[PDB]
Amino acid sequence: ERPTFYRQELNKTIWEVPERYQNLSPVGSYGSVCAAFDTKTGLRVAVKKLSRPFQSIIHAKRTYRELRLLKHMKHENVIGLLDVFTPARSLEEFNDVYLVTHLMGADLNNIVKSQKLTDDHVQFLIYQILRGLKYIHSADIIHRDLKPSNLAVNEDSELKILDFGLATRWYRAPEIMLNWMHYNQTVDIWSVGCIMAELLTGRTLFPGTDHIDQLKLILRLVGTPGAELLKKISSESARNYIQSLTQMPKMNFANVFIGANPLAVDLLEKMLVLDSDKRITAAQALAHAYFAQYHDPDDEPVADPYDQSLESRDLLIDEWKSLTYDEVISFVPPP
Ligand SMILES: CCCCCCCCO[C@@H]1O[C@H](CO)[C@@H](O)[C@H](O)[C@H]1O
Ligand SMILES: CCCCCCCCO[C@@H]1O[C@H](CO)[C@@H](O)[C@H](O)[C@H]1O
Ligand SMILES: CCCCCCCCO[C@@H]1O[C@H](CO)[C@@H](O)[C@H](O)[C@H]1O
């Protein structure tokens, strides 16, 4: 049975939603988001209305990509779908897509507020990110822009990784900062280390003022490339410049993170290595003794493989639109 919808105009735009979704209230901004109450489940939800979903080939492709990812993501620490709907009774009138998920209510700034968390709290939060990253990475997905605003947290400090959240460079791996084009999964591990550091200290690890200051600040802490790492640089210019650099020594992290759990420090040394091939993975981080009170190797699930070649095709608008439509139709709500 097609549910009954109703119109309403929020934050200067019309929203058409099923009746189960009551008390819509804007929470901010590829779409706008309202908090709402789901009378069917009894749950507070975030409802996202996609912005101009089928206006261009590029918008259509993105809508399809977002819809497909979110439908795939089914893990406690990763944002997924409670519902996806359209007013449309058929493909001919299909022009809007609404996405529904748990309202978390806060991201990792509202929960943190620039202060030191306790070690226990830090463990809990980083464990959750890594548990979610393991899941993500097993589907062969690199996040690439992990930061506090891309991490949704509720009151009980239960955390979910967000595709897109509601200073944006402080958490970027050096190789992303330098527009390398062969990233590995440990670009996300770098971002986790920056986040972990800040939760432990109350302070941004690398608050660069601009692009170059950021890299300066990273080199100060991790040192300049060693010889094994220079051997992996294909760009002659990059190579030349690094070789012109005055060798800088890697700092001792026990002196950077004064009074932190020695296991936290050890873990940060394994996350924040210049050479991405030498960074601890999310699976390995989960087994690190720092997360002893939370680690359960039998409840750290992995994803089904995800076909991302389906989203990087070159299709006509009406083809993406029709493919996106079928995804809406095929959607099965979680238990
Ligand atoms: C929905 C649960 C989180 C999934 C994380 C994927 C977020 C996708 O975000 C995308 O990630 C790509 C990485 O492949 C980047 O190259 C893109 O620029 C970015 O748009
Ligand atoms: C002068 C500043 C040096 C920045 C060097 C970044 C080192 C990151 O490490 C490198 O990551 C590359 C991209 O993912 C990989 O191809 C390499 O295997 C890896 O060593
Ligand atoms: C992977 C290595 C990337 C090369 C980074 C380029 C650094 C540019 O950085 C700038 O370099 C200028 C000339 O080099 C100088 O005027 C400045 O001292 C410096 O800030």
Swiss-Prot record:
> Which residues act catalytically here?
D163 (proton acceptor)
Q: Name one GO molecular function term.
A: ATP binding
Output the InterPro entries linked to this UniProt entry. Answer: Kinase-like_dom_sf (IPR011009), MAP_kinase (IPR050117), MAP_kinase_CS (IPR003527), MAPK14 (IPR038784), MAPK_p38-like (IPR008352), Prot_kinase_dom (IPR000719), Protein_kinase_ATP_BS (IPR017441)
Q: Which SMART domains match?
A: S_TKc (SM00220)
Q: Taxonomically, which superkingdom?
A: Eukaryota
Location in or out of the cell? Cytoplasm; Nucleus
**The protein, known as:** Mitogen-activated protein kinase 14
State the similarity comment: Belongs to the protein kinase superfamily. CMGC Ser/Thr protein kinase family. MAP kinase subfamily.
Any GO BP: regulation of synaptic membrane adhesion
The modified positions for Phosphothreonine read T13, T246
Tell me its cofactors.
Answer: Mg(2+)
Tell me what happens on changing K48R. Loss of kinase activity
Q: How the protein is affected by changing Y64H?
A: Lowered kinase activity
Kinase found in the keyword field: yes
* Protein keywords: Acetylation, Apoptosis, ATP-binding, Cytoplasm, Kinase, Nucleotide-binding, Nucleus, Phosphoprotein, Serine/threonine-protein kinase, Stress response, Transcription, Transcription regulation, Transferase, Ubl conjugation
Gene of origin?
MAPK14
Q: What is the effect of changing K49R?
A: Impairs MAP2K6/MKK6-dependent autophosphorylation
Give residues where N6-acetyllysine occurs: K48, K147
Q: What is known of its domains?
A: The TXY motif contains the threonine and tyrosine residues whose phosphorylation activates the MAP kinases.
